[PDB]
Symmetry: none
Subunit: 202 residues, 2 copies
Amino acid sequence: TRAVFDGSEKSMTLDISNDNKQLPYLAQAWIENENQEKIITGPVIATPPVQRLDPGAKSMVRLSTTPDISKLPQDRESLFYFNLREIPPVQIALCTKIKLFYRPAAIKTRPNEVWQDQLILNKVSGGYRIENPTPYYVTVIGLGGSEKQAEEGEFETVMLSPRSEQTVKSANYNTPYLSYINDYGGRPVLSFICNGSRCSVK
Amino acid sequence: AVSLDRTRAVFDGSEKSMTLDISNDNKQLPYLAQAWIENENQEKIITGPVIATPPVQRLDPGAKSMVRLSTTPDISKLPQDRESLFYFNLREIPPIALCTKIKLFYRPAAIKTRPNEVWQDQLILNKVSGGYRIENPTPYYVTVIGLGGSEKQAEEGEFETVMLSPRSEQTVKSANYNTPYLSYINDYGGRPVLSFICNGSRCSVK
């Protein structure tokens, strides 16, 4: 659901398949920027745009970077979405979107480093203002009053941009807990300790 | 699996908004429903002039809900003498999503119709080589769902559904019937069948 790249490889292929055992499908592929608008001008592209996949048949999509990848900020992450839509040739289709995180080598991490423990919760009316002081995107799943309640979250509540703040509507908890998705797809839980209006990771 | 209450919608421009019912038919798991508007080119618009709220909502197992469609003040820049086409989109997110797209016809208040008013009987069928050049001289989109040499064939026969835009024409491949029968879908989901009389290459409704 997420791929991190640094632009050292100009191309990548994804394996796609028609999982429908009976009908043929067209598979449309395209890139969107972080605001989820289609971009056909780079700096990440996908080919081919369209292709027919017969029942049970396998194929691939090629993702490439263009020279304009180097005009992106080099001290923070940039986000793209790879989109796949499958429609038989009320329109009902299968639609997938994978998050592509452009992570410049200047901000490459070590595997035993957790930047997500720098999140701050600010107690505001009707919820919290979360600060992400890091150069990376932080995908939050659950926010609760216990590890259990944070672990139950089934969806991505909010996604925090590099070096940013966002307000989320939430009940005020004495002991706030939040789960996030890491680079490997896991969902660790953080516990916060509050001091009046501000809570930091224990 | 989130489902919609209808397959097509008409936005009555004499109203400020309208609502669409959605329901989570999965009784076991919760889903997120993401809703957005597209323009006639199937391009996403998030500023107006037609908006869907909320953009994203949580549906609990078996829950029912709704999506509200509203106009911004920019809606007054669309043509007021013809309908405009938008698409209403719905994406379900499981805890491999499904995406539904219906047509949203925006009908300005100036061309508001009476409930038993028919305009699809103003289509003109022109016999061209290989078929018919169909003209829609009205301010509405008209969807033809069948064409044949009898009432039976217009309804029973398999036809490629063709949508005509306001005040335009489209050519469809077909046999040359002496007396053509055309079927369309109205705003109520009815499927009336028209019969044409051709004098020369021009056919109009009896």
